[PDB]
Amino acid sequence: SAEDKAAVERSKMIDRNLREDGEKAAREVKLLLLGAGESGKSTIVKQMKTGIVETHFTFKDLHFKMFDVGGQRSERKKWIHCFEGVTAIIFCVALSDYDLVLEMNRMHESMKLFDSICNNKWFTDTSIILFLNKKDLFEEKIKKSPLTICYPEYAGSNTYEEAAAYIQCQFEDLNKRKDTKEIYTHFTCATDTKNVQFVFDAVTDVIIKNNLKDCGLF
């Protein structure tokens, strides 16, 4: 039983290392990066600094693991549940492709992808950080191409602010768990270096909301 007595000790040491690893792994933020491909997620990945690509970065003493699954090219129904438990879903949508087509224009592709992800059964308590790319290009394009081409029910001047607000509201209305989860919209900036700050603020708010839901006062 001496050999067994040493085996039990070895298993106990293994289990304590496992506990330490779990404690370390529970202290990090998990983000799932999603988009329509032509939404410029590569720009977001660059600003943060085949198959699944993990990006690790530290910001204000907070560790972020962002998982990009754009290079999977497989049915999401089989592996999306693997991300049940991520802190947030970072969705990217391009504003320039409101008129360009892939049949059907790419803007409806992005909107229905967002509707599918936001209403996924594995994603009910997880928040979505929404990024709107190609701000300057979208502002410049609408000076000659009206937004009516994309949305026929839209009624407003072809200015950047009104069209962008309408697009954001249209994305917002896709949410059906208006009280369970929340949608976090941002307009991407190039030289301001504020996207990472927005992600940090959003994940901090998510953590605070989970703590408050736990405590029972909220």
Place this chain on the structure above:
Amino acid sequence: VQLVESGGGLVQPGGSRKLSCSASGFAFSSFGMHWVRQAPEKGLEWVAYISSGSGTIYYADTVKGRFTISRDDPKNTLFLQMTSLRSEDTAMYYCVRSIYYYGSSPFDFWGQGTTLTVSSSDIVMTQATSSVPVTPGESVSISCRSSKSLLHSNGNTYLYWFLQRPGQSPQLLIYRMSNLASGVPDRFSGSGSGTAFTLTISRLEAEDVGVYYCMQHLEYPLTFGAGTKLEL
């Protein structure tokens, strides 16, 4: 894998010494470690044991409380601190690794050993003889007996067969009954029952000569046999 010992030499009675065992070639932090000793032309005799993570420490009852065992995992160094030395502590000391999980061979690799000269209940394992002459190509069977039945309730019989060639360090051959060690030719085999145990060697070559030892783990302290020397 290379375990190298240092600290040997000649010391006066009543002094204190320190033996170092430096490991290079394996995960020292995942291996329990035994200190064993062998008196000049007398036989092997276990000294101490320290488990992985320095949790469990065992000393031989004859020297318990008079030696000390230390471990450095960030440096991979085993220390044996010896406080007072009589005329019996003179011997060759060996540093053995031992990893314990289901199916492991916990006496696989032995160190080269270091010599020390000092100026002037427990299970009993007895080996039948001390010198047996034989010629190459003839099967040789060695036997030894234990007091208790080493067959534990697990079904495992904690019997170990080692070989020490002239001028070399001990090498593991069998670790429970018939489980060959790593790198040992398949001509050796082992069997027995409860207390009576036999090691059989078929197609014996010239390099198989040396002193064979049978040991039991089963409990601490670990006790060695007399040691049967094959002659040629």
Place this chain on the structure above:
Amino acid sequence: IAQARKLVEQLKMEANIDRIKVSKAAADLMAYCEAHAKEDPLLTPVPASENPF
């Protein structure tokens, strides 16, 4: 002319098959499950003396 040629070749290879019928193959599973029934430790409970769990 050659896009489905591999498909039709594979389907043709799936036609010339040594067809052993469902009644000639159900008795095989029946015999296998009857001949190994006593050796199955979960179909028939094992005595607790030999049980390692």
Place this chain on the structure above:
Amino acid sequence: DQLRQEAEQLKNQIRDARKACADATLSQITNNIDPVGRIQMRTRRTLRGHLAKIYAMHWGTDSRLLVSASQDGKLIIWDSYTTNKVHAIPLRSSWVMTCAYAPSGNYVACGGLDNICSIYNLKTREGNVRVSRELAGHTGYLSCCRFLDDNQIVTSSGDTTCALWDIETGQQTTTFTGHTGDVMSLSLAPDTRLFVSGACDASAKLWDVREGMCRQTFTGHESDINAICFFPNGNAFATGSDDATCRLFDLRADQELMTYSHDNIICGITSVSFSKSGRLLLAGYDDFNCNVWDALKADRAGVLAGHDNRVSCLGVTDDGMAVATGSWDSFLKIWN
């Protein structure tokens, strides 16, 4: 069109030939056999230490050692008899979805969403578990790694194809193509001559490891197939889909032997395995539980009721002494 019509007529006449010569259903012959009653199994051992969803497990060839893969990037080898953790292996990719135990116990091959099958050597001189080799060449997520021997392994993927590898070289020896969906499971035959893989195209296919040819195709499910395993005699195999129907097909009859569905179960099957005699088909279901079906009478003759989350993986020992089940609640339970 010519190829479409030719394929359609081939399918029509082969289906007509298969149906016309079919004698009778499995139940029509096996009705006279007495049932097994209730298979009451209790949790003998509970293995704790995984701190995330458990996605796969494989029994050792000695019916005593276990390997289990968890979503937190840990591969744990347990001693099933005493609940001792023999080994703990940190995976490079945390997104592991399947993995297996070598028939000799010297290796373990394991992988997932990283498109790589990483192979680890257990019986090393260094006392640890090193990564023996990374097998790469798949463009979709990996499922059902299964060693043939110490140096040869078959893996399925979401590339609609399976691959037979050579661990000494690291090159894809054989490629099996023809599926029109994510191949989610495979099972090696007992005699190491054939294997069967089920895909997301609601079909399974029997493939030959040496010829690489499509020996058989099997249909009958309505949704994607999640799990597959061979009957111990190597002449039948059972599939479980998201339809919540388990089906037993015969390799030689080319027609499904029996259906293992009930009206109360709505969620699909996650894992499938047989007992040693091929009498008790165990099926780990999506809701919380595992069902013990009588593989001849299609009756739920026992239920394993633990696992407060989805049961993801099942395993039966080679001698049949126990059954280990892993679930999404990070707990492995052994039942006997």
Place this chain on the structure above:
Amino acid sequence: TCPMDEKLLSTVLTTSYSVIFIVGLVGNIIALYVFLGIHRKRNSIQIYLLNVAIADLLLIFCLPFRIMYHINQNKWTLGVILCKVVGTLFYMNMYISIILLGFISLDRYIKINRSIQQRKAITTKQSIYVCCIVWMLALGGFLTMIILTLKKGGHNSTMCFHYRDKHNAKGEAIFNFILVVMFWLIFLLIILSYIKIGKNLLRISKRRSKFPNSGKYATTARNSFIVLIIFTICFVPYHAFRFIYISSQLNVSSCYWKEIVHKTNEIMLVLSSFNSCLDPVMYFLMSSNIRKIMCQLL
């Protein structure tokens, strides 16, 4: 023992205690139902609140003896044994509730204000540990005090819940004083905890790093302030007057002070016991999901 008039006091005590009893019974039954039937998983705060519900349920079960005693003839018909049982059980359940509310405030403070990400939800183990320690200490004190009073105390009569001298029993007086001081310490802990929680929630909401759910933080801060105020108004006046109660109860004095002391003590017990009925309602109202469920069902 002046045989004073108490008919109006008996009526007001009876009515108020009956209302408190029925409200606490319904509220604590609903709380038990929501904590068991629909709550599969429990955290430390939920375990604490379940135990608070149990203690309040026992106190509510104690109350009908009080109301029947006060309504029948202001006299105790049964033996002194049941009188002592109820008198000790009411107070021990009340102090269990107070201690557990203090622990709820403490762990809420550690979980909201200073917690960074999580604690892997393993705080439950110490929750059951502290709960068992507190309950065992409470039952031990209850048993020892009742077994001392029933045997060593020779004062057996047909009056219950009445004013008594503590010359024959000074250990009960000193233990009451210790209970009051430990309650005041617990209340200081509670007030600091909830003030800090509210201030932190207000500063987070006023920072407004984010448009979404910035008004829920202000709501939660208001809820923290509201629960603090409710605890204060329910408990502080009673333990403020109990000091004078003990001071007058341990020395000889004319009963003219004693009637007003007894009346004030009864009113303060009413205030304290009204928390037993309020406590589940605070959890029902302040929980966003439960509040929405109530709104949609009604």
